[PDB]
Design a protein around this motif. Structure first.
Motif, short mmCIF file in Angstrom:
data_model
loop_
_atom_site.label_atom_id
_atom_site.label_comp_id
_atom_site.label_asym_id
_atom_site.label_seq_id
_atom_site.Cartn_x
_atom_site.Cartn_y
_atom_site.Cartn_z
N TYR A 212 27.43 -64.36 16.51
CA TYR A 212 28.69 -64.89 15.98
C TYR A 212 29.21 -64.04 14.82
O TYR A 212 30.41 -63.74 14.78
N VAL A 213 28.33 -63.53 13.97
CA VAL A 213 28.77 -62.54 12.96
C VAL A 213 29.44 -61.34 13.66
O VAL A 213 30.47 -60.82 13.23
N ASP A 214 28.83 -60.91 14.75
CA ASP A 214 29.36 -59.80 15.55
C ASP A 214 30.71 -60.14 16.15
O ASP A 214 31.62 -59.31 16.18
N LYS A 215 30.88 -61.38 16.63
CA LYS A 215 32.19 -61.85 17.10
C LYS A 215 33.20 -61.88 15.97
O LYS A 215 34.37 -61.52 16.21
N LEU A 216 32.79 -62.23 14.75
CA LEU A 216 33.76 -62.21 13.65
C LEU A 216 34.19 -60.79 13.31
O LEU A 216 35.35 -60.59 12.97
N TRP A 217 33.33 -59.79 13.47
CA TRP A 217 33.79 -58.40 13.34
C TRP A 217 34.85 -58.10 14.40
O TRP A 217 35.89 -57.54 14.06
N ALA A 218 34.61 -58.48 15.66
CA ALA A 218 35.62 -58.30 16.72
C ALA A 218 36.93 -59.02 16.38
O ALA A 218 38.02 -58.49 16.65
N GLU A 219 36.88 -60.22 15.83
CA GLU A 219 38.08 -60.97 15.45
C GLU A 219 38.80 -60.25 14.30
O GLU A 219 40.03 -60.12 14.35
N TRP A 220 38.03 -59.74 13.32
CA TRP A 220 38.64 -58.95 12.24
C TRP A 220 39.40 -57.75 12.80
O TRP A 220 40.51 -57.44 12.38
N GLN A 221 38.81 -57.05 13.78
CA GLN A 221 39.49 -55.89 14.34
C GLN A 221 40.79 -56.31 15.03
O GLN A 221 41.77 -55.52 14.97
N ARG A 222 40.81 -57.47 15.68
CA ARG A 222 42.01 -57.94 16.36
C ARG A 222 43.03 -58.34 15.30
O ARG A 222 44.24 -58.19 15.55
N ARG A 223 42.64 -58.80 14.14
CA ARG A 223 43.58 -59.15 13.07
C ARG A 223 44.12 -57.94 12.31
O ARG A 223 45.18 -58.02 11.70
N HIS A 224 43.36 -56.84 12.36
CA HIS A 224 43.67 -55.65 11.59
C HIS A 224 43.50 -54.41 12.48
O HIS A 224 42.62 -53.59 12.21
N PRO A 225 44.33 -54.29 13.52
CA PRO A 225 44.15 -53.16 14.44
C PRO A 225 44.42 -51.81 13.76
O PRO A 225 44.06 -50.76 14.34
N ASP A 226 45.03 -51.81 12.59
CA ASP A 226 45.37 -50.66 11.79
C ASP A 226 44.32 -50.26 10.79
O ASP A 226 44.57 -49.32 10.07
N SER A 227 43.25 -51.01 10.67
CA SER A 227 42.20 -50.80 9.70
C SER A 227 40.95 -50.44 10.49
O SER A 227 40.80 -50.95 11.61
N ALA A 228 40.13 -49.59 9.89
CA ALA A 228 38.92 -49.17 10.66
C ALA A 228 37.77 -48.93 9.69
O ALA A 228 37.90 -49.04 8.46
N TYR A 229 36.63 -48.66 10.30
CA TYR A 229 35.39 -48.43 9.57
C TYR A 229 35.57 -47.38 8.54
O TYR A 229 36.19 -46.34 8.78
N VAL A 230 34.97 -47.62 7.38
CA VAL A 230 34.86 -46.64 6.29
C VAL A 230 33.45 -46.75 5.76
O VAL A 230 32.83 -47.83 5.87
N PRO A 231 32.90 -45.72 5.14
CA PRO A 231 33.57 -44.43 4.88
C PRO A 231 33.57 -43.49 6.07
O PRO A 231 32.88 -43.71 7.09
N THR A 232 34.36 -42.45 5.93
CA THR A 232 34.58 -41.49 7.03
C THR A 232 34.18 -40.08 6.63
O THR A 232 34.81 -39.10 6.98
N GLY A 233 33.08 -40.00 5.95
CA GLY A 233 32.43 -38.70 5.89
C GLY A 233 31.91 -38.37 4.51
O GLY A 233 32.63 -38.61 3.54
#
Ligand SMILES: [O-][O-]
Ligand SMILES: [Cu+2]
Ligand SMILES: [Cu+2]
Ligand SMILES: [Cu+2]
Ligand SMILES: [Cu+2]
Lengths: 279, 78
Positions: free
Chosen positions: A218-239
């Motif tokens: 369910y924590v993993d499902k909430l990450w998926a729900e966060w991505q659907r709420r914020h399709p413009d935001s992504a994992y950080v950091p990036t390098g």
């Protein structure tokens, strides 16, 4: 077709087959190594040093891959089994069907926290607690004993509304979505659920309780729900961040997978229901 | 700067703390002579492996939370 279903919705046949597959991984010796791996990362991940499984941006992809390894082990026993998830914001009482004797069994008795019913009760002879720190060898729980209440949907929504995935310093002091979902700051979602179940779930050997997997599904499902709420935001950091797994860096213990390979869950499974992106 | 050491009998268990597969660590706690893994969080709170998800203010508080968790049982070494 791998579909992860809300635990509350499983048929009696699906509960039986999930339980049987978990008990067989335990009997064959495979289950306990999941408990060991998790405790090694719990004890090694630190705010001021290398951190991979916990208290860091890779908390979410790490547990997504750990749960995939576990689900694949269950499917090697019974190919029809998938991990169910526990929406603890909805199914928030001790009377939830999750805690019935035909699924995970209930809370522990008052004296020693021993779970007395269900398929994982020590008296069955089928659920020895081997990988442990508290030396007792029986499953223990104290549902609602150390914290009164599980998180509510409103509290979950307040965390899902945070637009930054994570923020420097990328540890338990961070603002941002990941650390509010993990729970070291704010209203506290994931850590509080561990505390509410009690017993081994409150310790670094928390996968000793099969509910671990349903909580993290369910924590993993909430990450998926966060991505659907914020399709413009992504994992950080990036390098190039010392001690933190960047987007395209590989992750221990596998070393053959990166956060980037785990962002889209649909490469591996879908949910029974997951809202699409909207306003 | 490291917390001070401590030594007391809490709930019939000897708990000790001192500045010093798991993180190479800066403070040691023992319960009846068995070492208990403990960790400090960035905000200065502490946890132990038997109460990992519930920060408490000090290493002695983590040791006491571990004795409460154990309900008299021996700790196994890590
Ligand atoms: O975090 O389990
Ligand atoms: Cu974990
Ligand atoms: Cu967890
Ligand atoms: Cu939009
Ligand atoms: Cu350590």
């Amino acid at each position: 077709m791998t579909v992860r279903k809300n635990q509350a919705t499983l048929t009696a046949d699906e509960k039986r087959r999930f339980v049987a597959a978990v008990l067989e991984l335990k009997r064959s010796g495979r289950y306990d190594e999941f408990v060991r791996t998790h405790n090694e990362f719990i004890m090694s991940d630190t705010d001021s040093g290398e951190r991979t499984g916990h208290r860091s941006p890779s908390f979410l992809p790490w547990h997504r891959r750990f749960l995939l390894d576990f689900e694949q082990a269950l499917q090697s026993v019974d190919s029809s089994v998938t991990l169910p998830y526990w929406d603890w914001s909805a199914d928030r009482t001790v009377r939830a069907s999750l805690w019935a004797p035909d699924f995970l069994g209930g809370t522990g008795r008052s004296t020693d926290g021993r779970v007395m019913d269900g398929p994982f009760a020590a008296s069955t002879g089928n659920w020895p607690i081997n990988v442990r720190v508290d030396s007792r060898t029986y499953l223990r729980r104290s549902l609602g004993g150390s914290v009164a209440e599980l998180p509510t949907r409103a509290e979950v929504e307040s965390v899902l509304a945070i637009s930054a995935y994570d923020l420097p310093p990328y540890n338990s002091a961070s603002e941002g979505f990941r650390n509010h979902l993990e729970g070291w700051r704010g209203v506290n979602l994931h850590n509080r659920v561990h505390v509410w179940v009690g017993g081994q779930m409150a310790t670094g050997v928390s996968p000793n309780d099969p509910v671990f997997w349903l909580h993290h599904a369910y924590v993993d499902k909430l990450w998926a729900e966060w991505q659907r709420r914020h399709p413009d935001s992504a994992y950080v950091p990036t390098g190039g961040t010392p001690d933190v797994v960047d987007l395209n860096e590989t992750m221990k213990p596998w070393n053959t997978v990166r956060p980037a390979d785990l962002l889209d869950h649909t490469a591996y499974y879908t949910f029974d229901a997951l809202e699409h992106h909207h306003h | 700067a490291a917390p001070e050491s401590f030594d007391e009998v809490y709930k019939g268990r000897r708990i000790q703390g001192r500045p010093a597969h798991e993180h190479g660590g800066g403070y040691e706690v023992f319960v009846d002579g068995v070492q208990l893994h403990v960790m400090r969080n960035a905000d200065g709170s502490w946890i132990s492996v038997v109460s990992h998800y519930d920060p408490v203010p000090t290493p002695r508080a983590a040791a006491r939370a571990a004795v409460d968790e154990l309900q008299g049982a021996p700790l196994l070494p890590f």
